[PDB]
Coordinates of all heavy atoms in Angstrom, one line a residue:
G6 N 35.6 45.2 -43.6 CA 36.9 45.5 -44.1 C 38.0 45.5 -43.1 O 39.2 45.8 -43.4
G7 N 37.7 45.2 -41.8 CA 38.7 45.2 -40.8 C 39.5 43.9 -40.6 O 39.2 42.9 -41.3
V8 N 40.5 43.9 -39.8 CA 41.3 42.8 -39.5 C 40.7 42.2 -38.2 O 40.8 42.8 -37.1 CB 42.8 43.2 -39.2 CG1 43.6 41.9 -38.8 CG2 43.4 43.8 -40.5
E9 N 40.2 41.0 -38.3 CA 39.6 40.3 -37.2 C 40.3 39.0 -36.9 O 40.3 38.0 -37.6 CB 38.1 40.0 -37.5 CG 37.4 41.3 -37.9 CD 35.9 41.1 -38.3 OE1 35.6 40.2 -39.1 OE2 35.1 41.8 -37.8
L10 N 40.9 38.9 -35.7 CA 41.7 37.7 -35.3 C 41.1 37.2 -33.9 O 40.6 38.0 -33.1 CB 43.2 38.0 -35.1 CG 44.2 38.1 -36.2 CD1 43.7 37.4 -37.5 CD2 44.4 39.6 -36.6
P11 N 41.2 35.9 -33.6 CA 41.7 34.9 -34.5 C 40.7 34.6 -35.6 O 39.5 34.8 -35.4 CB 42.0 33.7 -33.6 CG 40.9 33.9 -32.6 CD 40.9 35.4 -32.3
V12 N 41.2 34.1 -36.8 CA 40.4 33.7 -37.9 C 39.3 32.7 -37.5 O 38.1 32.8 -38.0 CB 41.2 33.2 -39.0 CG1 40.3 32.6 -40.1 CG2 42.1 34.3 -39.6
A13 N 39.6 31.8 -36.7 CA 38.7 30.7 -36.3 C 37.5 31.2 -35.5 O 36.5 30.4 -35.5 CB 39.5 29.7 -35.5
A14 N 37.6 32.3 -34.9 CA 36.4 32.8 -34.1 C 35.4 33.6 -35.0 O 34.3 33.8 -34.6 CB 36.9 33.8 -33.1
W15 N 35.8 33.9 -36.2 CA 34.9 34.6 -37.1 C 34.4 33.9 -38.4 O 33.9 34.5 -39.3 CB 35.6 35.9 -37.6 CG 35.9 36.9 -36.5 CD1 36.9 37.0 -35.7 CD2 34.9 37.9 -36.1 NE1 36.8 38.0 -34.8 CE2 35.5 38.6 -35.0 CE3 33.7 38.3 -36.6 CZ2 34.9 39.7 -34.4 CZ3 33.1 39.4 -35.9 CH2 33.7 40.0 -34.8
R16 N 34.7 32.6 -38.4 CA 34.2 31.8 -39.6 C 33.7 30.4 -39.3 O 34.2 29.7 -38.4 CB 35.4 31.8 -40.6 CG 35.7 33.2 -41.1 CD 36.8 33.2 -42.2 NE 36.3 32.7 -43.5 CZ 35.4 33.4 -44.2 NH1 34.9 34.5 -43.8 NH2 35.1 32.9 -45.4
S17 N 32.7 30.1 -40.1 CA 32.1 28.7 -40.0 C 32.5 28.0 -41.2 O 32.5 28.6 -42.3 CB 30.6 28.8 -39.8 OG 30.3 29.4 -38.6
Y18 N 32.7 26.7 -41.1 CA 33.1 25.9 -42.2 C 32.2 24.7 -42.5 O 31.9 23.9 -41.5 CB 34.6 25.4 -42.1 CG 35.6 26.4 -41.9 CD1 35.8 27.0 -40.6 CD2 36.3 26.9 -42.9 CE1 36.7 28.0 -40.4 CE2 37.3 27.9 -42.7 CZ 37.5 28.4 -41.5 OH 38.4 29.4 -41.3
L19 N 31.7 24.5 -43.7 CA 30.9 23.4 -44.1 C 31.6 22.5 -45.0 O 32.1 23.0 -46.0 CB 29.6 23.9 -44.7 CG 28.7 22.8 -45.3 CD1 28.1 22.0 -44.2 CD2 27.6 23.5 -46.2
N20 N 31.7 21.3 -44.8 CA 32.4 20.3 -45.6 C 31.4 19.2 -46.0 O 31.0 18.5 -45.1 CB 33.6 19.8 -45.0 CG 34.5 19.0 -45.9 OD1 34.1 17.9 -46.4 ND2 35.7 19.5 -46.2
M21 N 31.0 19.1 -47.3 CA 30.1 18.1 -47.8 C 30.7 17.2 -48.8 O 31.4 17.6 -49.7 CB 28.9 18.8 -48.5 CG 27.8 19.2 -47.6 SD 26.6 20.1 -48.6 CE 26.5 19.0 -50.0
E22 N 30.5 15.9 -48.6 CA 31.0 14.9 -49.5 C 29.8 14.0 -49.9 O 29.2 13.5 -49.0 CB 32.1 14.0 -48.9 CG 33.4 14.8 -48.8 CD 34.6 13.8 -48.9 OE1 34.7 12.9 -48.0 OE2 35.5 14.1 -49.7
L23 N 29.6 13.9 -51.2 CA 28.5 13.1 -51.7 C 29.1 12.0 -52.5 O 29.7 12.3 -53.6 CB 27.6 14.1 -52.5 CG 26.3 13.5 -53.2 CD1 25.4 12.8 -52.1 CD2 25.6 14.6 -53.9
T24 N 28.8 10.8 -52.1 CA 29.3 9.6 -52.8 C 28.1 9.0 -53.6 O 27.1 8.6 -53.0 CB 29.9 8.5 -51.9 OG1 31.0 9.1 -51.1 CG2 30.3 7.3 -52.6
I25 N 28.3 8.9 -54.9 CA 27.2 8.3 -55.8 C 27.8 7.2 -56.6 O 28.7 7.4 -57.4 CB 26.7 9.4 -56.7 CG1 26.2 10.6 -55.9 CG2 25.5 8.9 -57.5 CD1 25.8 11.8 -56.7
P26 N 27.2 6.0 -56.5 CA 27.6 4.8 -57.3 C 27.5 5.1 -58.8 O 26.5 5.7 -59.2 CB 26.7 3.7 -56.8 CG 26.4 4.1 -55.4 CD 26.2 5.6 -55.5
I27 N 28.4 4.5 -59.6 CA 28.4 4.8 -61.0 C 27.1 4.3 -61.7 O 26.9 4.7 -62.9 CB 29.5 4.1 -61.7 CG1 29.5 2.6 -61.5 CG2 30.9 4.7 -61.2 CD1 30.6 1.8 -62.2
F28 N 26.2 3.6 -61.0 CA 25.0 3.1 -61.7 C 23.8 4.1 -61.6 O 22.8 3.8 -62.2 CB 24.6 1.8 -61.0 CG 25.6 0.8 -60.9 CD1 26.3 0.5 -59.7 CD2 26.1 0.1 -62.1 CE1 27.3 -0.4 -59.6 CE2 27.1 -0.8 -62.0 CZ 27.7 -1.1 -60.8
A29 N 24.0 5.2 -60.9 CA 23.0 6.2 -60.7 C 22.6 6.9 -62.0 O 23.5 7.5 -62.6 CB 23.3 7.1 -59.6
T30 N 21.3 6.9 -62.3 CA 20.9 7.6 -63.5 C 20.6 9.1 -63.2 O 20.8 9.4 -62.0 CB 19.5 7.0 -64.1 OG1 18.6 7.1 -63.0 CG2 19.7 5.6 -64.4
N31 N 20.2 9.9 -64.1 CA 20.0 11.3 -63.8 C 18.8 11.3 -62.9 O 18.8 12.1 -61.9 CB 19.7 12.1 -65.1 CG 20.9 12.4 -65.9 OD1 22.0 12.1 -65.5 ND2 20.7 13.1 -67.0
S32 N 17.8 10.4 -63.1 CA 16.6 10.4 -62.2 C 17.0 10.0 -60.8 O 16.5 10.7 -59.8 CB 15.7 9.3 -62.7 OG 14.9 9.8 -63.7

């Protein structure tokens, strides 16, 4: 509940991008 600065020192960021061709079936 406290104020922790700088923000960048207290947080990790995950960025995921999944590219799937339109021909992909559910399988």
Side-chain angles (χ1 to χ4, degrees):
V8 176
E9 308 177 309
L10 283 335
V12 170
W15 292 90
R16 297 184 74 66
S17 291
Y18 304 83
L19 172 67
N20 189 297
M21 277 173 45
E22 287 208 306
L23 181 57
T24 299
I25 305 176
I27 62 178
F28 311 104
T30 59
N31 281 357
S32 279

